[PDB]
């Protein structure tokens, strides 16, 4: 095809932007009280919880819920989230709603890398438990065997800085002209375009509107790519 490699944003690009707020955050916040109130010092979750450095369980419970409500990027929160979400996914309580055409795209393209604000471990977990478009309530699908790599803010830098894309090109080992980057955020695409990577503006139901006067090619789905 036109490109050797594809770089994909997650939220608003391959997954509905509604997933994190309608499903992941509420799932996690509903589980918090039980895990905090049950206090066995020797647990794998107990080691995570101790890294908040708050001994009072009422204060700890309130603090965790505050961090979620204020969208605070605390790595101890992300680990706690990872632990709760892993069990949610493994138990079948949650499934990642990847668009049917994004599933097909990932399965057919030869070189596919993910770049997201979520950590690499969280991305791998999301792509391991994908909702089956043919039967949402049946078993989830594993797309990890179709993904060649994952990038996050820690591995590569901020999504709006050109340098971050230079870091990804180094790790991908591809000429910038051979890479297409798909994202719903124009500021990400602008950063990518600074190092010569081709760009495409993903448009999905629930995303912020696309202004009439805008420079990027718009993709409503990935069937034509
Ligand atoms: Mg996005």
From Swiss-Prot:
Record-listed substrate binding positions: 116-117, 159
Record localization: Cytoplasm; Nucleus
Family annotation (Gene3D superfamilies): 1.10.720.60, HAD superfamily/HAD-like (3.40.50.1000)
Tagged with keyword Cytoplasm: yes
Pathway: Amino-acid biosynthesis; L-methionine biosynthesis via salvage pathway; L-methionine from S-methyl-5-thio-alpha-D-ribose 1-phosphate: step 3/6; Amino-acid biosynthesis; L-methionine biosynthesis via salvage pathway; L-methionine from S-methyl-5-thio-alpha-D-ribose 1-phosphate: step 4/6
Keyword field contains Magnesium: yes
Cofactor: Mg(2+)
Binding positions (Mg(2+)): 9, 11, 184
Top-level class of the enzyme under EC nomenclature: hydrolase
Gene Ontology CC, one term: cytoplasm
A GO MF term: magnesium ion binding
InterPro entries: Enolase-ppase_E1, ENOPH1_eukaryotes, HAD-like_sf, HAD_sf
A family per Pfam: Hydrolase
GO biological process terms held by the UniProt record: L-methionine salvage from methylthioadenosine
Keywords: Amino-acid biosynthesis, Cytoplasm, Hydrolase, Magnesium, Metal-binding, Methionine biosynthesis, Nucleus
Free-text function comment from the UniProt entry: Bifunctional enzyme that catalyzes the enolization of 2,3-diketo-5-methylthiopentyl-1-phosphate (DK-MTP-1-P) into the intermediate 2-hydroxy-3-keto-5-methylthiopentenyl-1-phosphate (HK-MTPenyl-1-P), which is then dephosphorylated to form the acireductone 1,2-dihydroxy-3-keto-5-methylthiopentene (DHK-MTPene).
PANTHER family: ENOLASE-PHOSPHATASE E1
Protein's recorded name: Enolase-phosphatase E1
Lineage, uppermost ranks: Eukaryota, Fungi, Dikarya, Ascomycota, Saccharomycotina
């Amino acid at each position: 095809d036109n490109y050797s490699t594809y770089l994909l944003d997650i939220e608003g690009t391959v997954c509905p932007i509604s997933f994190v707020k309608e499903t992941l955050f509420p799932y996690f916040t509903n589980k918090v009280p039980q895990l905090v109130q049950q206090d066995t010092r020797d647990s794998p979750v107990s080691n995570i919880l101790s890294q908040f450095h708050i001994d009072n369980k009422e204060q700890l419970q309130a603090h965790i819920l505050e961090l979620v409500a204020k969208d605070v990027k605390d790595p101890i929160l992300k680990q706690l989230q990872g632990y709760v979400w892993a069990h949610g996914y493994e138990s079948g309580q949650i499934k990642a709603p990847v668009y049917a055409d994004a599933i097909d795209f990932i399965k057919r393209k030869k070189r596919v890398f993910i770049y997201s604000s979520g950590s690499v471990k969280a991305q791998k977990l999301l792509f391991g438990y994908v909702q089956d478009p043919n039967a949402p309530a049946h078993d989830s699908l594993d797309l990890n065997s179709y993904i060649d790599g994952y990038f996050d803010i820690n591995t590569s830098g901020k999504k709006t800085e050109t340098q971050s894309y230079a870091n990804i090109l180094r790790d991908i080992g591809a000429k910038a002209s051979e890479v297409l980057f798909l994202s719903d955020n124009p500021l990400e695409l602008d950063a990518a375009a600074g190092v010569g990577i081709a760009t495409g503006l993903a448009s999905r139901p629930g995303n912020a509107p696309v202004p009439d006067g805008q420079k990027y090619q718009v993709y409503k789905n990935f069937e034509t790519l």
